[PDB]
Ligand binder design. Structure first.
Ligand SMILES: CC(C)CN(C[C@@H](O)[C@H](Cc1ccccc1)NC(=O)O[C@H]1CO[C@H]2OCC[C@H]21)S(=O)(=O)c1ccc2c(c1)OCO2
Ligand SMILES: [Cl-]
Ligand SMILES: [Cl-]
Ligand code: NA
Lengths: 99, 99
């Protein structure tokens, strides 16, 4: 699709057997999801944005379906105010910015 | 152009006759730039990012060039860790997300 930016570019994702809404976010290096359980090992991480840093759990090799497109990569889980699909997964679905 | 996301989507902007680097950020509603001087009056705004809320100075109707495209709109000035071009100006330059 071509998504305009008049409104937030929100899509449905499937992660860990759950449906969630998330923002397609070119300014996010990493994918950050609100608190949920995921399988496998994790390690702690701090990530920073406007407002400062939050502590997250880093899970690797997680499969996510984004607007119908499957991708695998690292997912950070923690107290983000919005679920964000970052560049690590946007690349895998072939997303580009065009103007 | 068509910008892939393997690296941060950094572009050169020009504001107040000065060149700066900024991130094309589809996850930002608003454009937020580091401390600098802008003309006219400002109004208060609070914005919420991953680590919490910050106060910024809102300047309206500011002339800004983004990757060679001219925009005129609202710029927020405050302690952002990177300059971000948000949807308010991405729409003015005709940007879309495509996959
Ligand atoms: C600020 C940029 C450099 C980074 N952020 C991504 C943004 O797209 C963020 C994504 C975001 C969106 C909403 C709430 C929190 C974060 N947007 C944001 O802060 O926008 C602010 C400016 O406009 C306003 O509209 C949205 C909030 C305000 S982020 O959320 O802090 C972030 C995401 C993934 C990351 C990361 C930081 O570090 C490593 O991986
Ligand atoms: Cl990854
Ligand atoms: Cl590619
Ligand atoms: Na894993």
């Amino acid at each position: 699709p071509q998504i305009t930016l008049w409104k937030r570019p929100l899509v449905t994702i499937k992660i860990g057997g759950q449906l969630k809404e998330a923002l397609l976010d070119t300014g996010a290096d990493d994918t950050v999801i609100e608190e949920m359980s995921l399988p496998g090992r994790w390690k702690p991480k701090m990530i920073g944005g406007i407002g400062g840093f939050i502590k997250v759990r880093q899970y690797d090799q997680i499969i996510i379906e984004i607007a119908g497109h499957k991708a695998i990569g690292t997912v950070l889980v923690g107290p983000t105010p919005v679920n964000v699909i970052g560049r690590n997964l946007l690349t895998q679905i072939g997303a580009t910015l065009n103007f």
